[model samples]
Target: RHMKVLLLGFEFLPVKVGGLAEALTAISEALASLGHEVLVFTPSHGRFQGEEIGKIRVFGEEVQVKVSYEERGNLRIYRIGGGLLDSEDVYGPGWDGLIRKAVTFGRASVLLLNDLLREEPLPDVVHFHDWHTVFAGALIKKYFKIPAVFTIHRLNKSKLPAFYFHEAGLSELAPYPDIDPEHTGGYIADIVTTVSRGYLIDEWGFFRNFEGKITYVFNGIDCSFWNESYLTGSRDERKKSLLSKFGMDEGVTFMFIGRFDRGQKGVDVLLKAIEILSSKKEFQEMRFIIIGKGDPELEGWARSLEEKHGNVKVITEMLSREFVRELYGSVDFVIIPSYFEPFGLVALEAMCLGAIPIASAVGGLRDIITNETGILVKAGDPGELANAILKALELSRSDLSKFRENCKKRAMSFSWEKSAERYVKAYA
Candidate 1:
């Protein structure tokens, strides 16, 4: 029998500051298509004037919030608002206290689901993502008596305030002690999941409280949205178009797309590598296109490199998926040099559309990238990255053709349909 599912997170599309929103959209849409009545509840973040489809009252320790629902696509998105969420997304500015907001949303989400299921059929599973939605597990198990699954997308290890438990309405379960949602939620949820198998093994020590109960599910891409068949004209024509769009020459183009987490993301490493490559006459003809913002220090360094080198083009603004899809197809290679990455979705997406991934051998990246499909360099090594780029620039036409084919083949092995099926079993 098909199961009804509920997904809780911080943001959705048109409000994406990162991959969580993308993952949620793809998974929910795919699960819905697979015959599950999938519903997603996330903060509206004041991004849109969603139609007030329904409302429920949820109480915090000192106040009550009216959580509203809005229908979008196959997924019914519940917009948690009115003192529960600030005007911006979780990653954005204007925080009304992170812990307080998280607690409010958790209580509001659980209360809404509890009330909804009272009138409607109960969901087979309540799947919450990251620390933000961890308290929902407490609410689900405690009040609603439903099976809950917690996904630790990013391993956020921080000492949380003890008072947060009381504020989050989780004080009832005081014996548990640990209240850092990632830790507590993983401990309490019926099942715990991470984004990739590699990460599952790499990060098990911290969440070993869950022990044998933990499983890894790889995040999947919506192939149709990332398909190269949608593009018009010849590859050369598309390349020329992208080159014009970004104002660059006809040389080998490498693209980087992500926030600058300094050493974590290896932005400094990339800059040093780019500087090394820029000095060489052989690599002077090569072009680098970087899109996405980061820390002020790293961003300033990145901007300085843009001014210093004619070969580097940096755009700190968020690009649309459609634009990024085209950009992926146009670029010769995409670089992901993160010193620590949970699962580099950009690599999967890039390779899906034919960009060769020159990624660091870290986290889930090792699982997705192989020697045949993409080059894996040592993390935080500028010389290695520069050498890899030089090798990409030196590849023969036939060799390049094989890399593109292999890249697509590797990406094709992962899909939302497959991921959803696995999730169904996990819930079962």
Candidate 2:
């Protein structure tokens, strides 16, 4: 049966703040490709304003929010703007601002849906992502009685004052003075999903609340773009050029590209591992390229490491996607030391370019990396991670090539088409 699905999310492609945008956009496209009518609703975030479609009142004070619409084939996108949604920052100018944005978006979504229903049949299901869309999910469930699917990309684990719920006219959900949007979102949804099976189990304390309705759907990478076909030269030639650019004489090249965050990304752990490895003889033959910026302390540590070691280079600013693809193609290994990952997209992207991953064994990293594909160590264990690096250094060139080949094969198994098929079953 052909079904109409409405997707409510805070981020979407061309307005990305993080991996959520990529996941949301890709999943919508995949669903549309499977012959489903997919409509995406997101905050404008000062991008893709399109044309004014309508205006709706929001919140207890009844502030007016302007709505805009855009269409591309089977996918239709509605951008909600004005007030808090007009801000360029997707998540925040501050905590108060984010909550106001979420509540306003929620109220506006109901009015928009009301207008939509007058023109067409009610959607078979409403799929919303993360805590940002919790208000909208709860309201849709309450008002329209639509079956809802709430997908948790990563838990913010934030608790907010219940007053906001009351203000949004969802007082029934505000039993407590402080409400957890993630828990509330799951409670209101017909189905609850996360990015990976490992993540579903890893966050059992939270997922357990959803119990029977909870499931996992692994995310897929866009192999066509991340492919080695984008590489201009052989791995050795590319690696040599990159090393020269970094002013380093490299033997084995490893790259780490992600935010400098301690709680999740484990950049601190990576630095600790690097400190331990600095004393080893293998360190002389290893070149490290660390990219991304966040957490002033972690950035400081990365810069210090670069200054202390001639073989190490740190890039704090953003790099073009094409250049990142080149780095993936050139590197011998890509390190993901996340303390907890919902789904590690970087691992798949690296594997697509034939770069073996040395990732922590937690969340999606556990699901993605096999012994044949790449090496995995216990998460947050710096010594184990450092030992894994030494183990990689000892691998013969033939063994390294075999693992890289296995990685490429492993990446091919997780595709958007396959994921969308499973989602269709969930939708049914």
Candidate 3:
């Protein structure tokens, strides 16, 4: 069925801070390609300047909000602008800006939807992502009475102080101690879905009252661009190219991608494991690629370790998608030891490029990786993780090839096409 899907969120491409940005773009694009009507409402973030679509008057407020439209083939992109979004970051300049953006964006989004109702048919489904847009889901139920779906990308109780409700001019919507935004969102939403089976099951404790409404929907990647077989150059050629770019000779390469710093991402654990491996003569040829910026102290530790260990290289900035794709294709393995991951999309991306992931069995990592495709380790334990790497290094060439093939196969199983189709059915 060609369903009209309204996607509400704070993140999107061109200004990504996390995986949710990528997920929002990929799923929206995929849905559009599948012939569904996709309308996306996201924050202007002061950086977006699009063609002015029209002006919409917010319900219950006197403010005139400017709605700008961007041209995307099957997707209608709208950016809300008028107040705090002009200079303030969508997420925050501070807590003051954060809550203001949330409520302002929420109000503007609901008003925009109201305006659309006058000009166009009501959407079949309204899907919201994260707590930032969950207010819009509650509003959807309150006014439009449409079936709302809230996808939980992350679960954390970030309570809004009382002043934000007053600042946004929605004092009546002030959060109660027990019925917070997340709780209220689930209470109002018709269907609640998460990114992985593990997240859906593990996070249920928090939403115990809303159990029967919950479902697990695995997130997906674009196989056309991510697939190793389709990208330019041979696998060996790409690996050699990456090695040359890094100014390093060919060897068994692994990467530690994403943030570290007292952050849940276990870069410190990875470093400890590296220290263990470095002490062993058998693993002397192993090369480590550390990408991403985080805690200054943690970054300093990485830099010092790089100077001491000639095999390690640290890149302290975000790499372009081209570089990341090449990096995935080049590396023999990818290591993600996050203490809690909703769904390990980076690991999935690496798997698509035939780079086996040695990840901790937590959250969505447990769902994507299997014994045949990659190695699983304990979340914080360094010695066990070090041994896992050692075992992979000891595997015969033919055995490693089997793992690589299995990884690629496993990656193909999760596709945006399949995910989009499932979403359409969920609307029914």
Q: Largest lDDT belongs to which candidate?
A: 2
Residue 297 local lDDT, model 1: 82
For all candidates in order, the CA lDDT equals 0.79, 0.88, 0.80
Predicted candidate 3 versus true structure: per-residue lDDT over 299-346, tens digit per residue: 988998899977889999878987788789878989998888898888
- TM-score, each model? 0.88, 0.96, 0.90
lDDT at 266, model 1: 78
Off by over 4 Å in 1: 46-62, 71-75, 86-96, 172-178, 240-249, 279-281, 295-300
Models, CA RMSD each = 3.2, 1.7, 2.9
lDDT (10s digit) by residue, model 2, range 1-428:
78899999999988888778888899999999889999888998877554544565655455556677878888998988877888889998698899989988898888788988899988899999999999988888899998999999999898999988998889999999999999999998999999999999999999999999999999899988889886776888989989998898658988899888876788788888999999988889888989989999889989999999898899998899898999999989999989888888999999998999999999999999987998999888999999999988888476788888999999988999888888888888
The C-alpha stretches of model 3 lying farther than 4 A from their native spots are: 49-62, 71-74, 162-179, 229-249
Candidate with best TM-score: 2
lDDT of 1 at 308: 86
Summarize candidate 1's per-residue lDDT along 249-327 as a digit string, tens digits: 6878889887787678777888889988876888766888887786888898889988987778898987888989988
